[PDB]
């Protein structure tokens, strides 16, 4: 019973060193610098495809590497892969279980993976001799439901599973290689780096962490929400990301300093945030909202500059291209639209 | 016209692709999707086995009754957090729940001022009042009957319910036990509790669920045609 | 993935048996099907095509209304039947797969072909020269010049390329400018500009050597060229 007290207390102090340590280093906000450069005055953003056919709920899509394909996951059980310029379809990938929430597009436009509620990782090849889509791989290691999943490499591939843990994946021997563990709540969102070396997990308990691939190990964690996180993206640069959240804020956080930079809320808004991305050069953060419109916060402002207002259910969906071309936003309406 | 001679090819392929589409669109349309719920020891085991059968995670039963295709999701394997996976199960016909009569003198697990009947009653009444099944009906199975005349028998109804007047028999106990889950339903007008006691003839559980669900599908009908 | 063909041999004008080959190993449901046509020392041409579901059939204008062709999905069984014949139909016939796709290469299997005799506006692709002699290890380059700017409004040219190995069929070599096929190796190159095409070859061994062909895709009626030849 004691060495349980005397452990919790250890624990306690290092937290509040750990707390002194980050309030030391704070000596002046984001808003105070950024406060003598030109504020962009409007983005109007029109829409400019509308890419149709699909029958059910939208849960999740990714921009392929070429900036022109795209692939979107639907709960009738199609995984379509549309063409972003001329709006026809190259692909409809049927599903063996219709309830997915996740999808990807590997970087070498080879593969597609998309999980879902049946914790299993499906990769399918768009490539092979003959004229159909086979399954490659049927990643099978995971107790939880599967959130969110991106491809690491041709090779590889890492999932965050809703069992409060992430694991690496080997497709070639078809058994996970790193689990990373540390987590309290259930991991629904997940990141890879600009050079693909670390990530960071979005938990659902007011949390998130940084991993390393390499290691397997929690380097850094970082807190500050209230509710929970929803919806992580990296900044272009590598040394920072955006977390959504439930309590319509999502805010700023920073990898060399481990603190809080700045937090985009509104009175006006109250409802969750489903989507986080950021731009070509990281001066747009869009975030997708569940009161059926998205918006365009700024990132160095912390104002609002634009509403994609065009859409009709929840957007549970977007992101931005690799070119920084145009923009995708996926809704619960079965519609797709391609803003610019 | 502007068109080049293999890219109207691929515009032929995308007609296809969207053909083979709305024709299956149109077959996974027809056929009647409910969600199956329940406790740990509520028996949804025997109910989904008592029932005929044609076909780690989400399991998908499929079964036909009359000419009409049912499909049975019993999500019992995931232990996450319900909140997070319960909207996709938004568009469904019906819910299928089982709470068990004779749980009512066994309590829960590790604990022992705490019983589990309490437990469903509080599952029903959050699954109930959700945001999202707020016009879905409610298919409710009483599982076990006459191990719960065994045991009311000899141990009285007052050790769970401190509320009772009436005497330790099945006739009145069972539909107090019936209005005590009717009375957990805040949506009085948008959706209906059918409810049923679990029996060994097979027929008579598939034969009231195929009720239940062709008057929803009549409900709707009158509710799609501005008629109701 | 094989393509075999059958119903061929000596036919008299005026009648003749029909022509048709098997699908196996591949989803031949979703392909289109070419004809193509090469007459016995000498170059090859163009015959007909079905789309995907036998949705627009097109012929070439030479026999154009004088021949009967139809797919069959379920037994994998491609059919063409002959109306009137000509002293001229003694050819050897081909039987090609093709998929249109973003991303696709239409026409990488050709197959193996059978043989045929008979007893007795277009854009023009002409080929540089015939016949070349080379030695082994010299860098080549075949040029094939078109007589319309096969550069489109999309950004894409429309010249696949494919070399003829003496005794089989046919196999590409780069679709559209210089995108190797699936097995073939790096060695080869290519490279245009819109009217003037150029291919190139790194090292030459005594695995590659045959008959170059140039073929457009821009304009519908398909036209290929008159045949490089290689002289070890």
């Known amino acids: 019973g004691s060495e349980l007290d005397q452990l919790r207390q250890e624990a306690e102090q290092l937290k509040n060193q750990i707390r002194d340590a980050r309030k030391a280093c704070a000596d002046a906000t984001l808003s105070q610098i950024t406060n003598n450069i030109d504020p962009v005055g409007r983005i109007q953003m029109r829409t400019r495809r509308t890419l149709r056919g699909h029958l059910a709920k939208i849960y999740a899509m990714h921009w392929g590497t070429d900036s022109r394909l795209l692939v979107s996951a639907s709960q009738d059980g199609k995984l379509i892969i549309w063409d972003s310029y001329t709006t026809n379809k190259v692909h409809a990938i049927p599903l063996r279980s219709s309830w997915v929430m996740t999808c990807a597009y590997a970087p070498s436009g080879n593969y597609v993976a998309c999980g879902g509620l049946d914790n299993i990782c499906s990769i399918y090849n768009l490539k092979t001799r003959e004229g159909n889509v086979r399954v490659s791989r049927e990643l099978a290691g995971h107790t939880g439901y599967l959130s969110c999943c991106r491809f690491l490499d041709d090779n590889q591939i890492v999932t965050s599973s809703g069992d409060t843990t992430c694991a690496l994946w080997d497709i070639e021997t078809g058994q996970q290689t790193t689990t990373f563990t540390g987590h309290t709540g259930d991991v629904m969102s997940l990141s890879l780096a600009p050079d693909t070396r670390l990530f960071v997990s979005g938990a659902c308990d007011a949390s998130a962490k940084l991993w390393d691939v390499r290691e397997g190990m929690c380097r850094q964690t970082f807190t500050g929400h209230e509710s929970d996180i929803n919806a992580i993206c990296f900044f272009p640069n590598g040394n920072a990301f955006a977390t959504g959240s439930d309590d319509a804020t999502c805010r700023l956080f920073d990898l060399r300093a481990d603190q809080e930079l700045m937090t985009y809320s509104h009175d006006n808004i109250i409802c969750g945030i489903t989507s986080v991305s950021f731009s070509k050069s990281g001066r747009l953060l869009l975030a997708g909202y569940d009161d059926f419109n998205c918006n365009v916060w700024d990132a160095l402002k912390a104002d609002r500059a634009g509403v994609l207002a065009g859409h009709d259910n929840r957007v549970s969906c977007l992101g931005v291209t690799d070119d920084g071309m145009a923009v995708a936003t996926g809704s619960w309406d079965s519609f797709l639209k391609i803003w610019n | 016209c502007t068109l080049s001679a293999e890219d109207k090819a691929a515009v032929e392929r995308s007609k296809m692709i969207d053909r083979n589409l709305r024709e299956d669109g149109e077959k996974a349309a027809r056929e009647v999707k409910l969600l199956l719920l329940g406790a740990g020891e509520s028996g949804k085991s025997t109910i989904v086995k008592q029932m005929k059968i044609i076909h780690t995670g989400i399991v998908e039963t499929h079964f036909t009754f009359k000419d009409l295709h049912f499909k049975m999701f019993d999500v019992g394997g995931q232990r996450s957090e319900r909140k997070k996976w319960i909207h996709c199960f938004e568009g469904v016909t019906a819910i299928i729940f089982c709470v068990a009569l004779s749980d009512y003198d066994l309590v829960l697990a590790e604990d022992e001022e705490m019983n589990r009947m309490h437990e469903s009653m509080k599952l029903f009444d959050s699954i109930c009042n959700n945001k999202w099944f707020t016009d879905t009906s409610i298919i409710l199975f009483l599982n076990k009957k006459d191990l719960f005349e065994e045991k009311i028998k000899k141990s009285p109804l007052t050790i769970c319910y401190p509320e009772y007047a009436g005497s330790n028999t099945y006739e009145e106990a069972a539909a107090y036990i019936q209005c005590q889950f009717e009375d957990l339903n805040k949506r009085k007008d948008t959706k209906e509790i059918y409810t049923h006691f679990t029996c060994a003839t097979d027929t008579k559980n598939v034969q009231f669920v195929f009720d239940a669900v062709t008057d929803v599908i009549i409900k709707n009908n009158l509710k799609d045609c501005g008629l109701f | 993935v094989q393509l075999v063909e059958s119903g061929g041999g000596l036919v008299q004008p005026g009648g003749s048996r029909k022509l048709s080959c098997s699908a196996s190993?591949?989803?031949?449901?979703?392909?289109?099907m070419h004809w193509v046509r090469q007459a016995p020392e000498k170059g090859l041409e163009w015959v007909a095509y079905?789309?995907?579901?036998?949705?627009?059939?097109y012929y070439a204008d030479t026999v154009k209304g004088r021949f009967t062709i139809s797919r069959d999905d379920p037994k994998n069984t491609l059919f063409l039947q002959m109306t009137s014949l000509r002293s001229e139909d003694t050819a050897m016939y081909y039987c090609?797969?093709?998929?249109?796709?973003?991303?696709?290469?239409?026409?990488?299997?050709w197959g193996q072909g059978t043989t045929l005799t008979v007893s007795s506006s277009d854009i023009v692709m002409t080929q540089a020269t015939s016949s070349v002699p080379v030695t082994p290890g010299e860098s080549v380059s075949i040029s094939c010049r078109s007589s319309?700017?096969?550069?489109?409004?999309?950004?894409?040219?429309?010249l696949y390329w494919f070399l003829q190995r003496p005794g089989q069929s046919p196999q590409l070599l780069i679709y559209?400018?210089?995108n190797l096929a699936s097995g073939v190796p790096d060695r080869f190159s290519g490279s245009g500009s819109g009217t003037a095409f150029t291919l190139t070859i790194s090292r030459l061994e005594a695995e590659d050597v045959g008959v170059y062909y140039c073929?457009?895709?821009?304009?519908?009626?398909?036209?290929f060229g008159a045949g490089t030849k290689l002289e070890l």
């Open positions: 073929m457009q895709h821009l304009e519908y009626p398909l036209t």
């Open positions: 190993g591949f989803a031949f449901s979703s392909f289109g």
């Open positions: 559209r400018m210089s």
């Open positions: 079905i789309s995907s579901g036998s949705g627009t059939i």
């Open positions: 090609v797969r093709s998929i249109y796709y973003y991303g696709s290469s239409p026409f990488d299997f």
């Open positions: 319309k700017s096969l550069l489109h409004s999309n950004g894409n040219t429309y």
